[PDB]
Amino acid sequence: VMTKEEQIFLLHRAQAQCEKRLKEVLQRPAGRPCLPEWDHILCWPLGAPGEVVAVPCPDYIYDFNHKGHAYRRCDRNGSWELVPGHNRTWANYSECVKFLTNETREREVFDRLGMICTVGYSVSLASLTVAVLILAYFRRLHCTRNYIHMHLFLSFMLRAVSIFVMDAVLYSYAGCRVAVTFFLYFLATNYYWIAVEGLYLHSLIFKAFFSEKKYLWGFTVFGWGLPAIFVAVWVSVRATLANTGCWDLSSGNNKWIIQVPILASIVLNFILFINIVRVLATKGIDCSFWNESYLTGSRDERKKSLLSKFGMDEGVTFMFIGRFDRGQKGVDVLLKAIEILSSKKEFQEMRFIIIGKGDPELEGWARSLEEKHGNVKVITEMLSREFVRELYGSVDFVIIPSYFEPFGLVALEAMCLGAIPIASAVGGLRDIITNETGILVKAGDPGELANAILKALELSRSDLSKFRENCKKRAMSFSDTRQQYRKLAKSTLVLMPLFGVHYIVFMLTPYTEVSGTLWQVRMHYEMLFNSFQGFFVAIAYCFCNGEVQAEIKKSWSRWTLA
């Protein structure tokens, strides 16, 4: 706060006061006292012969110990005591300079943290430059998803250029204000383009159909426009009130009108994050395995052989596979529906295969129906997925009466193998299955399931091949779309909480420690994290992308041909 220029002005005023004091003394001389004089720092008073004179360390010297005194001695004749061997006046300034042997200990911390800044931002800028060049060079990488990545890359690149401008003018007034303004703008665009990445992923999953061109236009205004809005309001509120320091943004309440919009994006990302993880499964179905092209013969031949293995004649076959529990997978709903149907005449045309494990009372109930009716088969042992695939590709309908099912991967496996699903209208089954690709029923209602089974029997009297083909295309296009979104979410769902949690934790940690053990470990880690942010984004969206890696391996194989 105290500048060198300010000390010069205060020292000039002290010198002028000393000149006036000496003139007032010379006009009225009396006795033989030591006269006042100016020794370039402070003004000494009249000195009595043979006495020590003590002057408190001057206030206008900021770095002095203001609890001590400077000393002089006055000769018996009335002359200031001299330095031995020279014609210079002697003085004792040891108390004023007591706590002024600081030298440099803070240089070690400032040089380490500054090196971490330049190293981290250089690696980030170098990795982002080759990342944006790769996405623009290969024509196979040109799509809306990569265009959003290039905007996010550019925002972190300009942030790296801003800090290189700030420390450049530091190594040497209004030129500093525009430097920190551009930095805070680029800092805001970074967090808002992270929210764009979350909004784009959330839109792909929850919007069945939209225009990517128009959404990209709205994302550009969201990413570059809104940060420029509340930053301009920040500069408007700042320059008007006063003209304080260039880097003391944290001191006043002016920092909250920029941190709050940045916090709003983090809250928005936490909202988008929760919606996506509740719907997007961590892993899809094994597409290399669940395919009907692995089976031989026609479906009619496979069903007749299957029912013969179980000791039954040909009939419309329904299958259940899953855990035997009371209020979840819904085997209790199916067992009650089988009892309702057991008195109908249409029951003799139906065949049932129940596979699962769990509650003993539901296992005994299933075993009871198997023993009571010759068209009910129950399997409680463990089955290989090869035999499960044989069942999906042989039965007519698969019954999925779950009380809740967030993803419904069992439906996708059966639909890929031609089995028409009869499932509860809950969770993922509701989004996968439509009227043209299955039957949906209210959850927990044995009567609605029994009626759906009756409608499935009347449907089986006609050819169902076209129905089975629609179920295959639906499961295949749904899993293809889901696998594409999972690759983008593999990195987007990581960068959203990583940047958000770090920003919140760093904001909630104050600067109170003042270069303590807590301060140096927080300053070291936050400098490491913030400087390598561009390097984190470059790895997440380019260096680890499956399409980018396949393109550089293609180029390296063409350049390395034996």
Partner: protein, 34 residues
């Protein structure tokens, strides 16, 4: 704000402090010569 901002602020105060102390040690040499 972010850690890189506080570093520039501490650096600014540290360079100004260094400049001021160097000016004071120069005056202390003038007092010594006087």
């Amino acid at each position: 704000x972010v850690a890189e901002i506080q570093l520039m602020h501490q650096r600014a105060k540290w360079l100004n402090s260094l400049e001021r102390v160097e000016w004071l040690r120069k005056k202390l040499q003038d007092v010594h010569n006087y």
